Design a protein around this nucleic acid. Structure first.
Ligand SMILES: [Mg+2]
Ligand SMILES: [Mg+2]
Ligand SMILES: [Mg+2]
Ligand SMILES: [Mg+2]
Ligand SMILES: [Mg+2]
Ligand SMILES: [Mg+2]
Ligand SMILES: [Mg+2]
Ligand SMILES: [Mg+2]
Ligand SMILES: [Mg+2]
Ligand SMILES: [Mg+2]
Ligand SMILES: [Mg+2]
Ligand SMILES: [Mg+2]
Ligand SMILES: [Mg+2]
Ligand SMILES: [Mg+2]
Ligand SMILES: [Mg+2]
Ligand SMILES: [Mg+2]
Ligand SMILES: [Mg+2]
Ligand SMILES: [Mg+2]
Ligand SMILES: [Mg+2]
Ligand SMILES: [Mg+2]
Ligand SMILES: [Mg+2]
Ligand SMILES: [Mg+2]
Ligand SMILES: [Mg+2]
Ligand SMILES: [Mg+2]
Ligand SMILES: [Mg+2]
Ligand SMILES: [Mg+2]
Ligand SMILES: [Mg+2]
Ligand SMILES: [Mg+2]
Ligand SMILES: [Mg+2]
Ligand SMILES: [Mg+2]
Ligand SMILES: [Mg+2]
Lengths: 220, 77, 64, 149
RNA sequence: CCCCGGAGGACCACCAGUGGCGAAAGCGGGCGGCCAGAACGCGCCCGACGGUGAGGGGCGAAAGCCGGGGGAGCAAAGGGGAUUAGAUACCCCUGUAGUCCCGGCCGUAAACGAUGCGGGCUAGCUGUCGGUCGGGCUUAGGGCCCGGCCGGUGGCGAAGGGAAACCGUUAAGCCCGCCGCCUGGGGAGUACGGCCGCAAGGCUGAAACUUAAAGGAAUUGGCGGGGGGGCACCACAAGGGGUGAAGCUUGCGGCUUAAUUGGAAAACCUCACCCGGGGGAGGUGCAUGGCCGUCGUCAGCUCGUGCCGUGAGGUGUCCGGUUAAGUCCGGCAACGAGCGAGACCCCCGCCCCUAGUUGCUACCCCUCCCUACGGGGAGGGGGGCACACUAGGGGGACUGCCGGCGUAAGCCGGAGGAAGGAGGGGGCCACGGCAGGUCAGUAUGCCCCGAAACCCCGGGGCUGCACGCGAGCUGCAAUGGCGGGGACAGCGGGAUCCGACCCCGAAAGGGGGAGGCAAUCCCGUAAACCCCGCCCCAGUAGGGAUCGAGGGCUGCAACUCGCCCUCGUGAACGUGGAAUCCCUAGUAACCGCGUGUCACCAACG
C-alpha cells in the first residue's frame, strides 16, 4: 500500500495480495558466475529468512568481508543495507576499551562461525538468522503517566526495532558470559547463537525476549 | 559633530561615548544611522572603527566610532 | 534550499519584469542571462536568483 | 502483617521514617492498589542525601490539574509555601525479590540480607506480609524467653 | 443488589428563556376560592384632584432569639478515620442545634444596576414578552408569518458625556423639580450619650492623636502550582560512553601555620605572604575605559509616512500556512524600509586552466642479489610532469528535473549527480541588560601607605593535612597481561636550535658530529592494530600505591621541594549508592603524535 514510489535496489515479491519488500539484492555472483562466500567459506544462496517483516531489514547481499565504512546511518532506514553479519561485528566493539577495533570483532565472529558449523553441521549464516527469529520480541512496554506514578502500556515493535533488539541481546548476552571467568569470547558468542537458534531458555537472548513479552501481557 | 558627517554622504555611522558623562554612574550615550553593517566581513575588516579614550576630570570616557564612506559598496546588490 | 529571503526575491522579481523576454523555463539559460543582466558578485546568489526566475516562467506559463 | 509495615507511595519522608523507627523495622514496602512499587529501608536511606529534602531544597507539590511537580529551590524560585518533602516512592528502590508464605524461611535468608526487606504474597500474588531482618531476631529471642526464664 | 407493600419530610427536574410578575425583600407542580397590581383597546366619568418629601410610619434575605409542632436529606458545634512538621482545616464516616410549619422578635446583607423618585426632548439596527390594528396563510385554534402603534425586557451603536473603563430613548446626554448623601488617609462604625431589643446586638456617631498620601482607570513589564503554540543532545525519547566508590594528579573550602597570598610549567625570580637585613601586585570592578563571558545552540530590535488614543501608549511587529530565522506566502489600517537572519569570509569534498631549482616515477639504461630459469627485486643516473602532489584562478548545486500535496511560501518521495536540501566544520556577536569578570594586563578618578610598596636581598611559604566538594589519570582484568615478530599517518616545531650517522653504557644517559635559517637537513620506521608463544579465574604472570638500596639529567642551587633509570618490596581495588555529565557520522569511544607553558618537569590546554 504505497503511492510514494520506491528507491531502486528494492524489490517487491507480491504474494497473494501482500507486497513483501526486500531492500537488498540476493542475486550477486562474480563475472564468471561463481557465488560469493562470506569469509570465503559460507554461501548466502541457501539462506532463508523465515520472517516476513524481518525480510525487509536483514541484508543478505553476498559480501566477502562484512565491512561497510559506516556510510548507511545518515538516512532513516539506512541500516537495511548494512549486511547482517556486519551488524554482529558492529555490536562486539563494546565496552569502551574495544570501540573501533573492528579487526578484533571480525576475528571473533569468524572464529565463532567456524565453531557453529562444526558443532552443528549447519550453515553458520543460517543458524545466526534463526537465532534472530527466535529472539526478536514482538511486543514491548512504554512509559505512561497518570498524575505522578508512571505505569506501563503494551505496544507493537516495528520490524526494524526487533532486529536492533535481537542483535543487542545476543551480543550483550555473550559479552557478560566472558567477563571475569576463563571462557573465551568466541566460545561464549558461538554458544549463545547456537542456544538461541534452538530456542533454549538458557541463552540470554531468549530470557530477555521472554521477560519483555511477559511484562507486556500484564500491562496491555 | 553629527552634521559634520552629514557633509559627507556616508551611509552609516555609530558614535559611542562611554563614561561618567554627568554623574558617578557611567551611562553610554550612542547615536547611530542607517545602512551600517554590524557583523560579517564588513564589520571588523572593511568598516572603519577607531576607539579612543580621553582623560576628563575623573576621566577615561572612551569613544568608539564606526563610519563608512559614501563609496564603500559592500556585497549587496 | 529552505526559503528564499527578500533580497533573493526582490532581486529576482525586478530582473524578470525589466527583461521579460530574456528568461526561459530552464535553469541553464536563466543562469547565463542573470550573470550578464545583474551585478552578481556571489555564485550562490546568482544560482538562487536563476533558480527562482525559472519558476515564475512555469507559473506564468501555467497560468496561460 | 500487611497494614503495619506497608505504606502508600505518596507518604511523606518524615512519616515513613517515623513509621520505620517506631515499629523497629529495617524497611517498608511501597504499595498502591495492591501493587508492589518498591521498598524503602534504613540502610539505603542512611547514605541518601536526605538533608536537602528536609530543608526546603527539594520539594514536590501537586498542581491544580493533577501533575506532580518535583521542583528544586534556588535555581529560580526560593519560596514555595505549602509543599511536601519527598514521597516514599522517591527514596524507595525498585523491589527485586518476593517470598511466598507457603515456602520455608531459609530460601530467602540470602536474598533478605541483600535486599534488606522482602515482601510476602499469597496464592493471588497480592501483598500479604513483609519479612524483615528483625523478625528472625525476635524469633531467636522467643527461644530464650521460652527456655531460660 | 432485586421484587411485593407501608410511613414520612422536603422539593417541583426536562419544558425553561439577559422569559414573567412584584416597590424592595422575593415568587416555579395541578385544581379551586378570595384578593392585589399593572399593560393594551376606548368620542366612558371627574376636571389639576399633581411631584418630591425633613420629621412620622409600614414592609424587609440569611443567620439568630422566644414558645409550640415536626424532623427525610443536609449539616455549625462535637465524636472518629486519615493527611501533616504541626492540622483544633481541606477528604472520609458520623453527628446536634439549624434548615421545615405556626405566633412573636430581630431589622442587618456585595439588601447591587454598587446607578433616588417624577416629567419633557434627542439617529438608528437588531432578539424577545403582553395588548391592539392592517395584510398573507391556516393542524380552521386562544394558531403562524409580514408591517404599524403602545407598553416591558436584552445586544450593537448616532449626537452628546466621561479620568478612563464606558453610558448612550431602560443615559452616566440636553433640561425642569424635590429629598438623601460627600469634602484626604489612619484613629473608626471605635469612645461617650440617647433611643430600640428577651438577648445577640442595632441605629445615631465623634475627638485627641498620627500621618503625605490612601485611592480610580488605563499602559509597559514581571510573575502564576492559568490557557495556547514553537523550539533545543548546554532537554527528553532511542542509544553509546561515562562520573559518583579504590590508589594517585590537581583546583577550591575548611583545619593547622610565623606565613600558608589575592581573587571569582612555583626550588631563586615569579611574589603579591612570613622571619631577618638594605612609586604602588595598597583599597573601591556600586567611580570608570578597553576587552571579555552570558542572555544568545536567540530572533529580536527599530524607523518614514499614515491610522487609534486627551495620554502613558498601541498599529505595522496581528492572524493562517511555512522554517534555522521577524524566512517567506496569504488575510487585515496599514504601505514600505534598516540593523539582526542571511548574503559575506576561511577550510573540506569533485572537475578544468596555469606551473614543475623544490616534490612524483609510468619510461629507460649500469650495478648488486635471487632465480623453479622465464623473470623478479633493491640501489645510481638519465628522461618526463604522465600520475600524484603543491598553489592561484575558475566551474559545479539551483529545489534544478520527475511524482504527490499546497492558491503559494514550501514540504515529502525519486532519479541523476563528486556533492541534495543552508553540502560539511568554523569566523563575524543586533538593541538592551546581568551595580555580571577583570583597578594583580596595560590605562585611569577618588581615598589611602609617604625616604615604606621595591621586579630588593637570604631563608621559609604558596607543596603544610582528620575531612568536604570539583575536574582528571590507571586500574579492577582473559575482547586481557607478558614476550618476540610485521606494519601503516597527519599536523607542528627547529638557530644556537632540530639534530642524521659513529662510539661508550644494562637503562637512564655520555662523547664526537653530517645536514638544515626550511616541499631540500632533522625531530620521524607513532600507538592502538595484525601474527606467533607463555599465562588460565586467582587479589593472580591482574593492579602498581607505598617503601628500601643504587645510578643519572637541568640548574647558582634539588633537604623541605624537581625529573629519568635499575634491583627489590607488592596496598586498596574483583566494575562502584543517592545522584549525575556528554554526544547524531568519519561523529561517540579507543590510540598515539606535535605543540603552549618551558633551564628541568603536563595526569593540563
Ligand atoms: Mg577476577
Ligand atoms: Mg552571517
Ligand atoms: Mg424619613
Ligand atoms: Mg431565617
Ligand atoms: Mg451525613
Ligand atoms: Mg437531626
Ligand atoms: Mg448603594
Ligand atoms: Mg463620574
Ligand atoms: Mg452602548
Ligand atoms: Mg453611621
Ligand atoms: Mg453606645
Ligand atoms: Mg503583560
Ligand atoms: Mg536518555
Ligand atoms: Mg573516584
Ligand atoms: Mg492587524
Ligand atoms: Mg630558597
Ligand atoms: Mg596552589
Ligand atoms: Mg612544604
Ligand atoms: Mg595497562
Ligand atoms: Mg576510567
Ligand atoms: Mg610511515
Ligand atoms: Mg632518516
Ligand atoms: Mg616524536
Ligand atoms: Mg598480588
Ligand atoms: Mg602486572
Ligand atoms: Mg636514595
Ligand atoms: Mg628533592
Ligand atoms: Mg621493579
Ligand atoms: Mg575487596
Ligand atoms: Mg563508574
Ligand atoms: Mg619548545
Amino acid at each position: 500500500i504505497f503511492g510514494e514510489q520506491l528507491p531502486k535496489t528494492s524489490r517487491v515479491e507480491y504474494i497473494g495480495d501482500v507486497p513483501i519488500i526486500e531492500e537488498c539484492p540476493r542475486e550477486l555472483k562474480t563475472l564468471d558466475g561463481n557465488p560469493i562466500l562470506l569469509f570465503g567459506k559460507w554461501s548466502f544462496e541457501d539462506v532463508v529468512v523465515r520472517d516476513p517483516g524481518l525480510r525487509r531489514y536483514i541484508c543478505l547481499k553476498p559480501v566477502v568481508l562484512p565491512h561497510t565504512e559506516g556510510r548507511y546511518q545518515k538516512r532513516r532506514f539506512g541500516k537495511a543495507h548494512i549486511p547482517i553479519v556486519e551488524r554482529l561485528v558492529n555490536l562486539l566493539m563494546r565496552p569502551g576499551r574495544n570501540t573501533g577495533k573492528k579487526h578484533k570483532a571480525y576475528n571473533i565472529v569468524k572464529r565463532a562461525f567456524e565453531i557453529i558449523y562444526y558443532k552443528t553441521g549447519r550453515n553458520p549464516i543460517q543458524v545466526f538468522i534463526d537465532a534472530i527469529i527466535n529472539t526478536a520480541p514482538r511486543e514491548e512496554i512504554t512509559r505512561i503517566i497518570m498524575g505522578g506514578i508512571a505505569y506501563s502500556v503494551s505496544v507493537d515493535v516495528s520490524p526494524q526495532r526487533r532486529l536492533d533488539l535481537s542483535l543487542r541481546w545476543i551480543t550483550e548476552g555473550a559479552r557478560q558470559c566472558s567477563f571475569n571467568n576463563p571462557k573465551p569470547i568466541e566460545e561464549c558468542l558461538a554458544d549463545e547463537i547456537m542456544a538461541a537458534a534452538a530456542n533454549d531458555p538458557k541463552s540470554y537472548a531468549v530470557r530477555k525476549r521472554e521477560e519483555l513479552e511477559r511484562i507486556a501481557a500484564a500491562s496491555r | 559633530a553629527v552634521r559634520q558627517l552629514m557633509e559627507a554622504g556616508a551611509k552609516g555611522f555609530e558614535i559611542v561615548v562611554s563614561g561618567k558623562l554627568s554623574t558617578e554612574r557611567a551611562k553610554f550615550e550612542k547615536i547611530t544611522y542607517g545602512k551600517l553593517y554590524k557583523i560579517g566581513y564588513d564589520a571588523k575588516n572593511r568598516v572603519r572603527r577607531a576607539v579612543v579614550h580621553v582623560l576628563l576630570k575623573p576621566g577615561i570616557y572612551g569613544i568608539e566610532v564606526r563610519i563608512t564612506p559614501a563609496t564603500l559598496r559592500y556585497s549587496d546588490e | 534550499g529552505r526559503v528564499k529571503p527578500k533580497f533573493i526575491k526582490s532581486l529576482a522579481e525586478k530582473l524578470l519584469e525589466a527583461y521579460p523576454d530574456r528568461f526561459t523555463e530552464s535553469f541553464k539559460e536563466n543562469k547565463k542571462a542573470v550573470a550578464e543582466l545583474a551585478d552578481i558578485p556571489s555564485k550562490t546568489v546568482r544560482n538562487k536568483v536563476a533558480g527562482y526566475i525559472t519558476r515564475l516562467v512555469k507559473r506564468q506559463k501555467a497560468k496561460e | 502483617p500487611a497494614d503495619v509495615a506497608a505504606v502508600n507511595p505518596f507518604s511523606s519522608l518524615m512519616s515513613t521514617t517515623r513509621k520505620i523507627n517506631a515499629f523497629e523495622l529495617d524497611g517498608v514496602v511501597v504499595v498502591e492498589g495492591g501493587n508492589i512499587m518498591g521498598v524503602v529501608t534504613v540502610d539505603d536511606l542512611a547514605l541518601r542525601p536526605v538533608e536537602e529534602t528536609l530543608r526546603g531544597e527539594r520539594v514536590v507539590y501537586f498542581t491544580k490539574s493533577g501533575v506532580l511537580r518535583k521542583a528544586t529551590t534556588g535555581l529560580s524560585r526560593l519560596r514555595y509555601s505549602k509543599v511536601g518533602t519527598l514521597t516514599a516512592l522517591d527514596v524507595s528502590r525498585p523491589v527485586d525479590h518476593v517470598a511466598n508464605v507457603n515456602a520455608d524461611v531459609k530460601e530467602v535468608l540470602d536474598k533478605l540480607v541483600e535486599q534488606g526487606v522482602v515482601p510476602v504474597v499469597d496464592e493471588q500474588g497480592r501483598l500479604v506480609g513483609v519479612l524483615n531482618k528483625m523478625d528472625i531476631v525476635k524469633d531467636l529471642a522467643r527461644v530464650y524467653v521460652t527456655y531460660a526464664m
